[PDB]
Amino acid sequence: GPELARKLSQLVKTEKGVLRAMEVVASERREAAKQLSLWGADNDDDVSDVTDKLGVLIYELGELQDQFIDKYDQYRVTLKSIRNIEASVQPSRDRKEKITDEIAHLKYKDPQSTKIPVLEQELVRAEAESLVAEAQLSNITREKLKAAYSYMFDSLRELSEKFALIAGYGKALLELLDDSPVTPGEARPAYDGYEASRQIIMDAESALESWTLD
Amino acid sequence: GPELARKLSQLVKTEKGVLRAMEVVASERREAAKQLSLWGADNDDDVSDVTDKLGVLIYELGELQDQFIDKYDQYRVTLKSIRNIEASVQPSRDRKEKITDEIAHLKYKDPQSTKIPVLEQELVRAEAESLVAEAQLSNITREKLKAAYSYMFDSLRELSEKFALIAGYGKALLELLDDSPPAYDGYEASRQIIMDAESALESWTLD
DSSP states (O other): OOHHHHHHHHHHHHHHHHHHHHHHHHHHHHHHHHHHHHHHHTSOHHHHHHHHHHHHHHHHHHHHHHHHHHHHHHHHHHHHHHHHHHHHHHHHHHHHHHHHHHHHHHHHHOTTOTHHHHHHHHHHHHHHHHHHHHHHHHHHHHHHHHHHHHHHHHHHHHHHHHHHHHHHHHHHHHTTSOOOOOOSSSOOOOOOOHHHHHHHHHHHHHHHHHOOOO | OOGGGHHHHHHHHHHHHHHHHHHHHHHHHHHHHHHHHHHHTTSOHHHHHHHHHHHHHHHHHHHHHHHHHHHHHHHHHHHHHHHHHHHHHHHHHHHHHHHHHHHHHHTTSOOOTTTHHHHHHHHHHHHHHHHHHHHHHHHHHHHHHHHHHHHHHHHHHHHHHHHHHHHHHHHHHHTTSOOOOOOOOOHHHHHHHHHHHHHHHHTOOOO
């Protein structure tokens, strides 16, 4: 590929892969949610509840990931767009180099030629074109770069601050589940953590609606 | 394993899938960091500097992830552990089931006198074993389920908050880039950010 493209194309590629992997996580994590809830489904009353809600909360991690994927994509194409521009600039470099090597050939093996003054003149224009070209590239790179990661980090901070919430609430559910041993023979007590458990969802939905950047 | 363990096996299989997906994500993030730093090297000096730092931050995302991935495994094996017990209790149930039917057939059709007392006495032992088995299944399911997810979530809360902070500093770094279509001097500033990050990570605590 063109020279100034390569290193950025390598990164663009690697980042496609990171997306593809995040997709799988989110997908599978949602499958875990269901399988957990369905497993807990046919157990003791308390386990069947805690697990039901744990299935909701873990399902959201799924949805939340995928929302962050959509935005990662936007990050990735923005980079892709920078790479395309680093590609468009190559010609003006090759040209400068060719005109240089043409003079070098002609001055050395034919100094009498009348097309050296003209090529010399062509080279100053070419060099000028190349400077402008590269100045432009820079002002585009800087801007697209800044907008790129700037957007991605805000999205990642969202994802992650919302994960934080669900973890914290997720652990608040596990408080409902009693792990006090049982004597072989006698039964498990009454479980009335339903009002509480439903409350934890409502609290979690409340925290995720109201969350804002800063 | 047998029937009682089926649904939990499915689950265990999926979390191995999730662990493995995560391992890839961390891995690549790390490649992305490097690749971003090395491309930045051929650019204006502000870009070269900021991009090398962004690299350091993003690399750490990847490491935090592997740190969480290790902890995720302990989670998964704690489930596998529950599954095993669900598996070894089945026979105990299947057995008690059998013996009782052996009495159900022996009674009604030739309620004969020689066998019963031997079967009657084998069922008392099976009930005994069933009780102890069910007790252990119940008690272990809850201790380990609670532990498993309790642990997992604290670790996830760790990964996330630490991500969140890194994301913060990532964005700060970008301010050192001049969106003005003058000599770069943000080295002091960018160092301070990384130093800040490392500081804010070292001093993180649950609770």
